[PDB]
């Protein structure tokens, strides 16, 4: 048939990372990013932050269809994500980069998101290893919210308190698509935070989540 | 029968479902497929890029010839050429959009009613609609119905090269009041109004960290 | 189209990753250099910010690795592919961390197959401000951490944390750590030594080829 993940096109033999185009079970092309360095490769990457030049701070319809610049950061917007996620089994790993340069990084053993009418809602597995910590299953079984859409289980809005969008709660342990503040920040959780890494007063340089049948 | 069956451009991509602003590849009027990089972020999406400042890595002064056809780098700076620059703005109505950005990560914009540029064989004479907003203020209108003049081609109304003057390639009058391909010189310049100048924007003593130019079907 | 200077000539102007044709007519997507002295080179190195490690094996050079988007080694089975056929002319473009350009140029480069380690074979310097630091290593094979293939009783790649075709060591060690300029440790750097010499380490390196 066709290439249907990054894990395809690297056992094809794409050894650099880059923008490929995949094939969605619906089919359907999609061109994605592929990470084929990191942890042995094959990665499609949905998120991405680098330097602060886009801004997250987006609504519903946004990041439904997704925002961003293949040329930089991006959100592969979430009728993709789900599309992405939801016939094999797909792993998360995300990677944090502070400002000194020190990686650190959680592994997680499943990853689907829900369609829109399920509210993209969190399926999240068992944290395996990672030097960052688990600051994700605590946003388990928890719908996407964003600023035009307010899911989040707390009387105020959590993506407006926090400046960003995520599976809120009550509210964040992390928060990846929160302003991108440049190291240790004064104001409280509303950077690109991520609890058990570098605590809510730190926003790291880089963030990338990205998906692998495992 | 791609020619026919394929977008021609950004906005038709937009239209189709692409959401990340990328390099893909549209259909010329005269059939002739060309890669473009399609802005999908900004004031709404669908704009093509046709000149970008970011780093300094490419060197914008360059002939007549060189401009013509297009140089740089899909991976960074470049300037899409101007053949290809009026063959997007010949048959139909785009708007021009102007981004950028200085070292203290300020955004400023302006847009135009509407932007297109002649053949060659007028110069790529500029036809400049009315400035509809924009932070960095207007600094193109000054330059309404003017050649492109390069280094090694002068075109302008300056009993001088403006192009050599102030190190750059433009509609040039008599000179300039925007200089968006200049020398790329990193904030504050003690030179004159060589870098990439925005006069409304930070005067002719302040070269940007980024510039984007870019167009829509008005 | 073959080649970048297929593409070129087929009104291809801006630089950026164009597909080829291998000559046994596999696809080849590859970054093409179409501004650098009349433009149409193939790139096959590209060292820029430090953000990948050069410093790998055998397998890893043997099929390539990197970013599209940054740095990168297409692949000593694909430099070899693509020096197979006919002759090709060689470019080392360099910058320095005070944005200073050095280039070196030679008339021919070819690397054999894996069989014979992707031995080097290089044509004379045609000129270059950067000086030859190439051709002291002319048939020599490549060698790397786990496959030491040079003529030092000890290990290079080891010695001088990188991948390339060292003899006693080298005189030129592109594939080297990203130092960031001077540096006192000795000739461990994306180094040239007929440039900056074997304590400067530059900012950018890129190796490219193009039909002679
Ligand atoms: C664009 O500029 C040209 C000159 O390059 C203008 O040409 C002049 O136009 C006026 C009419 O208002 C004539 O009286 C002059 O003699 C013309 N000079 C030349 C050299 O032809 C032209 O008018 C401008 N066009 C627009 C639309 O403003
Ligand atoms: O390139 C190899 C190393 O660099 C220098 C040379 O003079 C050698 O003596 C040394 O071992
Ligand atoms: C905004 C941005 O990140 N763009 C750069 C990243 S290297 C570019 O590829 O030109
Ligand atoms: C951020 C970036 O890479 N630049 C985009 C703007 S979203 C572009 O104009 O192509
Ligand atoms: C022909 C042209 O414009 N290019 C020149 C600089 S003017 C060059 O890079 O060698
Ligand atoms: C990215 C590349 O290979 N070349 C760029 C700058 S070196 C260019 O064509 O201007
Ligand atoms: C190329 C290289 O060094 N690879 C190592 C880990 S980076 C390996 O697992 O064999
Ligand atoms: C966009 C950019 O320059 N980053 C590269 C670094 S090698 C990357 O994404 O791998
Ligand atoms: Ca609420
Ligand atoms: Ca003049
Ligand atoms: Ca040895």
Same mark, same amino acid.
């Given at each position: ?38 942890? #042995?490769?094959?990665? *499609? ?9 886009? &801004?997250?701070?987006? !609504?519903?319809? $946004? ?69 960052? #910590?688990?600051?994700? *299953? ?9 600023? &035009?859409?307010?899911? !989040?289980?707390? $009387? ?59």
């Amino acid at each position: 048939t066709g290439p249907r993940t990054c894990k395809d096109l690297l056992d094809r033999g794409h050894f650099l990372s880059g923008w490929h185009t995949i094939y969605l079970p619906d089919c359907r092309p999609l061109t994605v990013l592929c990470d084929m360095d990191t942890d #042995g490769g094959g990665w *499609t990457v949905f998120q991405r932050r680098v330097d602060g030049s886009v &801004d997250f701070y987006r !609504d519903w319809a $946004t990041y439904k269809q997704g925002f961003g610049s293949r040329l930089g950061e991006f959100w592969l917007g979430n009728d993709n994500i789900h599309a992405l996620t939801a016939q094999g089994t797909s792993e998360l790993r995300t990677d944090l980069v502070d400002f000194e340069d020190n990686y650190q990084f959680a592994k997680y053993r499943s990853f689907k998101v829900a369609d829109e009418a399920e509210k993209y809602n969190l399926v999240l597995g068992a944290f395996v290893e990672g030097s960052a #910590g688990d600051s994700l *299953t605590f946003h388990n079984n928890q719908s996407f919210s964003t600023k &035009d859409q307010d899911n !989040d289980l707390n $009387t105020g809005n959590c993506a407006v308190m926090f400046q960003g969008a995520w599976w809120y709660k009550n509210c964040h342990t992390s928060n990846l698509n929160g302003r991108y503040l440049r190291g240790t920040h004064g104001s409280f959780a509303n950077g690109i935070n991520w609890k058990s890494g570098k605590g809510y007063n730190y926003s790291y340089k880089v963030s990338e989540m990205k998906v692998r049948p495992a």
